[PDB]
Amino acid sequence: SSLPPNALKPAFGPPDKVAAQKFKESLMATEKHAKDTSNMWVKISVWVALPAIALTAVNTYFVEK
Amino acid sequence: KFVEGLSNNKYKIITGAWAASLYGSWVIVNKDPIMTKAQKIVQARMYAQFITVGLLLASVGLSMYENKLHPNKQKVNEMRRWENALRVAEEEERLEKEG
């Protein structure tokens, strides 16, 4: 239905910028660092937090009695 | 014997140590150039508040380390103020009578 002649011409240019491909490959570096720093923080939790909660629980049970 | 002067300011040292603790945790965690700003800020805040509430009980042990050296306070400073309040009345009305 009578397209203007600027219809099927391209619109965005050269799609191989090194910036966005290194962005896509840094999308693996964030996942690797997350898989390190979640293991680190769950070790922090099960070593540091739970004995403190247990000691504070026996203290608060004694004084709650 | 230094416990008097730098346990009178407990809640100045605790608050300044909290601010310095968040600063010295933030400058450590921000050197890792991979994370979001928000995750760095919340991890620094967690480390800071942990060391701060850990120091809050050290000041309790220090507080009874002061309390053996000055027994039953808040009630015998009041009577020192009362002695200075009775001397200021007697010194004044004796010169009111003979002046």
Side-chain angles (χ1 to χ4, degrees), chain A residues 26 29-30 33 37 41 44 48, chain B residues 32 34-35 42-43 46-47 50:
Chain A
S26 68
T30 72
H33 200 271
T37 198
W41 266 108
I44 296 297
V48 179
Chain B
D32 297 330
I34 195 65
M35 281 191 305
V42 300
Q43 285 175 172
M46 204 180 306
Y47 295 146
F50 168 65

Side-chain angles (χ1 to χ4, degrees), chain A residues 34-49:
Chain A
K35 215 175 67 175
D36 166 75
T37 198
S38 179
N39 270 5
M40 174 163 285
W41 266 108
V42 70
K43 291 313 282 179
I44 296 297
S45 159
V46 79
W47 270 350
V48 179

Side-chain angles (χ1 to χ4, degrees), chain A residues 8-61:
Chain A
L8 270 80
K9 283 171 57 211
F12 274 132
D16 207 343
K17 269 76 66 180
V18 62
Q21 203 209 351
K22 296 295 185 292
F23 166 82
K24 188 257 176 184
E25 292 138 14
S26 68
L27 261 68
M28 293 179 184
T30 72
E31 290 176 5
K32 174 61 170 289
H33 200 271
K35 215 175 67 175
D36 166 75
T37 198
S38 179
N39 270 5
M40 174 163 285
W41 266 108
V42 70
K43 291 313 282 179
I44 296 297
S45 159
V46 79
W47 270 350
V48 179
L50 181 64
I53 292 182
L55 294 174
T56 323
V58 65
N59 190 280
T60 202
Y61 164 70

Side-chain angles (χ1 to χ4, degrees), chain B residues 82-93:
Chain B
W82 159 245
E83 176 50 55
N84 285 147
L86 191 54
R87 148 181 302 157
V88 75
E90 205 265 351
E91 276 175 4
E92 202 271 347
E93 194 139 279

Side-chain angles (χ1 to χ4, degrees), chain B residues 5 20 23 55:
Chain B
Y23 200 79
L55 168 58

